[model samples]
Target: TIPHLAIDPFSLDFFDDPYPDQQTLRDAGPVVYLDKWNVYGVARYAEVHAVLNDPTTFCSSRGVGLSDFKKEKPWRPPSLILEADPPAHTRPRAVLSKVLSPATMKTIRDGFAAAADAKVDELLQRGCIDAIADLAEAYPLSVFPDAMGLKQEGREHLLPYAGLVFNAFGPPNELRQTAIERSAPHQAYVNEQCQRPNLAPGGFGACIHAFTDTGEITPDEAPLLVRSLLSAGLDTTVNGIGAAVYCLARFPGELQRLRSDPTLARNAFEEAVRFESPVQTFFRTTTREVELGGAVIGEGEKVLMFLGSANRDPRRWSDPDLYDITRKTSGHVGFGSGVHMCVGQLVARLEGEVMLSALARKVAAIDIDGPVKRRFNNTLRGLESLPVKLTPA
Candidate 1:
């Protein structure tokens, strides 16, 4: 009972940046059928939220990528939790959740905060720098490696390998092919590091193996789940940190407001995520025929939900596109919503807050002195080079 709508899914406009097309689709009506990918497109906040939360009706098991999971070969074993639906998804998620529980993250907080402070101090001494590379990449790469207990060689490969995987989630185009080529050399090394014997003691990777040992989840499922952690983890935070810095630079008034209160770091970061979602789009499949906004989506069809679009849906927010540090972005889909929401979000929030606060603490304000260049990935919305002049506090 699907609608015979003829929207293009692979339009060049949607890929480079999708906000305009997202609005078009949302206006075209909810559940607008895309003939190109044979899926429904959900662009508003409500429908996207419902589809993401309702595992029974809008399942993720069909593969959250462009490819049909039941039909195509997954490059790696699918994520145990991110790709799983409940009851089956419950146990493994519980095990990992317990491992990353509040206390464990707090145990690492001082060190993470200190690392951020140190990076800020270094950058501030220089007076001006590319906030994206110097501050954003610097902070997560500093702490995440140690938090995961990885050695230097394998640690170096995390970001690139992750970049490749995230790219692969989109259609196989020049970008995806190029990422595959770039990551070819590091694939074996990354796989080796995931093995039980190779993992550094007390790391999250080792902990996943421990769950396998205790008959919680199979050892076979161990590496891939940990792989999911690496694949989904790093770049988003890097992009998010970049986004926050970009926001502060653009809104000097807000930057002054943030400088006046250090604790606003968390709220500021959340606001940036809402304004520019790091992970732009993810997919789900309809479990049965459903009608939304007068359009019908048939059973077993894929649906592309625009997380970035929904974040700025004018119907949902007062000033949908404005970057406001003081705003309460409680329901933003930057980390996603409902049961399948991002579990590592707390970690991402911590990274953003610490990094932004450290930068704000060291420098009074950052001003963009040159054109900002974006790093284009099919999935990640991020910056490549953001040149700025930092005024020391």
Candidate 2:
């Protein structure tokens, strides 16, 4: 029998600072039943990695949320890729995989790197800035919408839409409710932008539609695929960059290491992801009766994987709590694992590498100038405000 723990993992209190609670969950057992949500949770690195790899046994088709799509109507249309299983997931994943390939990334890499340099120049003028709003959010917002061929007018909707999508993965709590109300208009705008006519030539949105020419995906499916890019693209990277900045700010030693060896920018970004997982938790439903952590979970049971906890699990990492850029973070669960691993990770990495590298080349050190306030979300961990003072080299 699984140890039944009574804790609300989705509550505001938990989102505020989850490390202590995450340790509790990991220490409790490999698999603990959350009596509050009536879900099974795995906090250990091995278990989480196993569950992600065995997605065939623990499927994603039932909806990766507390409310199973099989039993209830989704708040919005289910993600064809994120919420789908093998055969149904195959072609869509293939199309996106090609679209975000190293070859594809090469097209945008120079531009992204240039933009990062320009943005860092502007930030250096300010000296003191909110890393979250000024650097993290601003950089992605400026580049990605243009990359997607979205019009400038309603581009602000991207963040809200992403917030809602992430929050909806949890129970229908107040956080989810508020996101729902705020995101509807943004969602509508994004859907409209997905149309072929709205997209500019030579951009990702247009490229997704090109799949229609190859018959890889349908014309109708093209918009949704573009929608997937919109859904996964912005906020995740914004928070990722924010987390990197926060980690560097708090651990000046790591920042010094990065400044001394600018090539370590990518490593620093990845280490921050391992340190502070931007996308925290995700759920998968058991396909049938299966044993995990010495307990059998019934068919169709919801299994929550604590990705943040797994990234920091002591069993897998030495001094897991310490932010060390030199630490090899290749297998971190920050971008998830297996077939359903985050498709947009290459894009996120490019963004992180470009920006942080520019910062490393230009700035001497990053120090916290004021109190840091965390942005609470059901699934994403990031900063609301990170006040930082940068000293020039």
Candidate 3:
């Protein structure tokens, strides 16, 4: 019999501070069944990475949430890439890969870099600011919409829509219900913007639409593809930035190390991801019975992979709890692994590199100015407000 824990991982109490729960799950066995949710969870690095790699056995097409799409209606149209398996996932993944390639990112690097510098400069004038609201959210909202050629008028809707999408992965709890109500208008706005006519020429949204000309993806599929961008492109990066800021402020020595090297900006961001893991958990259903950690899981069972726990697993990493920027973080599951890995990671890294580099050059030190508030989500871990006082270099 599988080790069962009567815990609701999605409950607000769990989200408030999950490290203890994560440890219990990881320590219980290679796979622990959450009796409350009736889902199996994998917290060790090896098991989590294996599940992410074998998308065939742990299929995603049925829906990457508790409510399997085959069994129930999806809250929204499924993500063309994130919620899909291969063959069906191939073309959309290829289109996005091309759209967000290194070369394409290079073309926009200077612009994003400039925006970072400008945003940092503006925030320095205040000396103390809400890193989450003023910098993390503000910076992405300022630039990503323009890159997507979205109308500036209703761009605020992006965050709410992202929150809704992420929360729906959990049960029909208050968090999910509240997000649905809050994101209703934003969902409509996003749907409207995904249309070909609504997207400005030469932007990412238009570029996704352009694939239709080449028969890479059908015209009807184009909007949902763009919808993928609208859903994923902003919030993850926003929280990632917040994570980096929060980590740096808490570890001034590491911040100074980044400031000294300057080039460590990218590494610093990656380390923060490994340390904080903005996107914490995602579900993958077993396609067939598979043996793991001396236990066999039956087909069609939901397996929750704790990316946060895996990144901090002491069995895989030494001194896993510390926030050290110099560690080789290559194998971390922060951006996930295998076919379903985050396609927008390059863009997210570019944003982090540019912004953190700007701060490294201009800011002498970062100090926690006041209280820090955690933003609770079903799948993401990040700060809601991080007050920090910046000293000019």
Candidate 4:
């Protein structure tokens, strides 16, 4: 028999500090029916991993949110990459894969690094700063749009666009409703940016448009793909960087380890992602009836994967609650797993690596100087503000 649980995983109270509820979900059973959302949930590592890895059975096509596209019209057109199952997802992914390839990463590395260095210099001069705005948000805002070949005019809409996308993944709660009501300006700006005429030559967006010339993807498909790049790259990376900085500020010894070996910068970011699990939960529609754990889940049933809970599951790792940058973080699902694993991850990793290394190189220590404020989204776990003072190296 399946264990049925009554828990509101989406409540603002849960978002305030989800770890307690997350642990409770994992401890209840391998899979539990979430009575609140009327969906099944997987909070343990093995179960979440299995569900994501077996997308054939647990599909993304119905929509990766509480609202199934089959039953309800999507607020916006469904994402070409995020909401599509295979074959439909294949071509656009190939184009993006080429755009963000390791070779392309190498080409972008110097530019990213130089930006980090310059920002670090500015932050050092300032001495006191908000980790969320000053470093986490600022650095990404400075670089990623340029990398995408966007001009600066309407870029303020980027975070709101992310808010709309992530919030829409939940039920049509006030947060989703608010985002929808406020989405027009951001939506219009993003739509304009996605056009071939607006994207600068040689940028990632332009590169995707070029694929249409070869007839790989239709002109109609190019804007959505470009929109995916915009959706994929921004707030997730912003929050990830914010999470890493907050981890170091709270864990001085871990920060010391990073300061000792700047090479550990990449691993530090990976560890923070594992520890915090910024992109918390995503939904998958069961494509076929399947028995999971002790329950028989019917096809088309929405299954919620509690990624944040799985990352901290004791069944998955030793010292699961501790932030250890040196620990192997390969199994973490922060950027997700399988064919639908985040496409913009390399960009996130590079941004994290450069900024963390710069912080270690320039700052002797980082400490909280004021109260930390939590930013709530249906899906994202991040700070609204992280005020900190940096001691000079």
Candidate 5:
């Protein structure tokens, strides 16, 4: 018989530090029922990966979170691209995948690199800066809006809005309510920008509209596809870049290693994603009765996949908690796995590598001046502020 131990997924304490609670769940069994949300959770790496990949058995169509689209009114229409499964999920993914292909991403390489260099120089000149804001937030928020072909109006809302969307995935609690309230005002502008005219030609956003024009996807689904890009693209990269900086600052030996071989910049960033896992948890609903790791999940039940926990799962990774820049973090589910893996991943990797490399070239030494604070979003692992003093080499 399974123990009746329960963990509240929405607790502020758990958000502050989820590892212990995750470990309890993993040890308790593969799948455990949370009396609080009445949902099941899969904390081990293998179970989480299996559930995400086998979308047929574990459907994403149920809406990936607590507020089931099948039941409650979604905060917005479900992300047609991210929310749909199988036959419905296939076409739009193909259309959007083309826009995010390596060839298309390469077009923005020089521009992203140049912006990264300038931002690093600016941060180094200031001597002391918050890594999250000065470098991490500066780079992506600067590049992506233009890359996606937006006119730069209300670009400031990008990070905050993305933060809200990710948090809204969890149960309707203070966090969810907070995010909805904060994003309410900007919802109209974000929706308006999803239109074809708002997206500049020859960019990803325009390409999404072009797909709609060709009947690859309906116009009603177009905005939600763009919304998928908005939700996944912004805060995840920001926190990833910041985590890379944090890792390098704490392990100066690793920074020296990176400086000696600038090519390690990409490795360093991916390693950060594995180590910290910016996007923490996402849910998938089980479509049939499934048995795994001594637990059974019934059909129509929700299973929470803890990406952060799985990345650091001791069974799969040795010294999983340490920040090793050279670790083969490739197979890690940091960007998720299987067909529903992050489509914008290469773009994200390019963004991180370009910015990290630029920063490596600029800074001589980087370390925190005081205590750092983490911002707890229901789904993203992020830092609110990381005050650091840097010396130019």
Candidate 6:
């Protein structure tokens, strides 16, 4: 029999601490039926990885949430790149791949590092500060917009807009409802920023539009692709960086390990991503009647994949819950897998590495001095604030 549980994973209470329920879901079975939302969920590493890899069978097109696109209209237009399936997803994704490749990350490296060094110095001078606002969010805010060619004005809307997008994935609860109402202005700001004239030339948004000249992506598609950069690129990295800081503070020995070998900066960030997955959950719809986790799911059914749970599945990793900086994080699905893997992962890695590198070079200690406040989002795991003091090395 399929395990049916009455857990409300979308509740702020669950968001407050998802591990207990995450374990419950994983322990229930490979696939369990969620009585609250009436959707199926897969929390174990094997099934989560299998569902993500077999995207054709577990489709992203029919709405990657509790509400099927076939049944209800989306709150906003579906993300042309992130929310669409192949053929439709192929063209825009290809252009974005070209625009945000390793070469682009390399071109932007020195500047990112320079920005990181300055940010770290400023934070060290403060002595004690909120890690999320002062460092995690601040660093990305200073640098990423420049790359995306977003104008200086109304940039405050980016994070809120992103929060709304992720929350919209769940059922319409008060948390999600509140986010939707507050998102109007932010959504407008985002929509305006996606256009050509509003964005600065010689930036990522402009580069995406350049593909229109070659007829690779249409002019209409260009703006949507640029919107993807803002929606997908900014918030995820902000949270990932926050996750790294949280992990380092909780496990001081790992920070010391990183301090010993500055080269471990990259692996440290990667491991943090696996240890505390920022993008916690994403849903996939079954294309047809298919077998998963020893159960048969009918077409049009939604299956939520818990990336956070999968990364910490005891069946997969030896020390599943430990935050070891040197752990091999290769198979972790923190950035997802297969065709819909996070589009801006390179940007996330670059920002994380440079910040970690700068901290290792300039700061002696990352002490969590005050209370840590966790941000409650249905799909993202991150801190709203982390009080910390950094001793200069």
Q: Identify the candidate with maximal lDDT.
A: 4
lDDT of 4 by residue, 120-169 (tens): 89998999999899989999999999999998899999999998899999
Name the runs in model 6 displaced over 4 angstroms: none
> What is candidate 3's lDDT per residue for 268-310, written digit by digit as tens?
9999999999998889988899997777999989999999999
Considering only N, C-alpha and C atoms within 3 Å, which residue pairs clash in candidate 1? none
Least accurate 10 contiguous residues by lDDT in model 2? 179-188
- Candidate 5 off by > 4 Å: 213-215
lDDT of 1 at 316: 86
The runs of at least 3 residues in candidate 2 whose Cα sits more than 4 Å from the true structure, single-residue gaps closed, are: none
TM-score, cand. 2 vs. native? 0.99
Q: What would the TM-scores of all predictions be?
A: 0.94, 0.99, 0.98, 0.99, 0.96, 0.98
Assess the local accuracy of residue 278 in candidate 5 as a C-alpha lDDT between 0 and 100: 86
Q: Estimate every model's Cα lDDT from 0 to 1.
A: 0.81, 0.91, 0.91, 0.92, 0.84, 0.90
Model 3, runs deviating above 4 Å:
none
What lDDT tens digits, residue by residue, belong to model 2 across residues 128-163? 999999999999997899888888898778898899
Q: After superposition, how far is residue 309 of candidate 2 from its true place, in Å?
A: 0.2
- Candidate 6 residue-pair clash tally: 0
| Candidates 5 and 6 compared by lDDT, better number | 6
Model 4 reaches what TM-score against the true structure? Answer: 0.99
- Best-first order by lDDT: 4, 2, 3, 6, 5, 1
lDDT of 1 by residue, 40-142 (tens): 7788888888877788888777788787787788766677887888887887887777667787788778988999999888887887788888888877899
Better of 2 and 5 by lDDT: 2
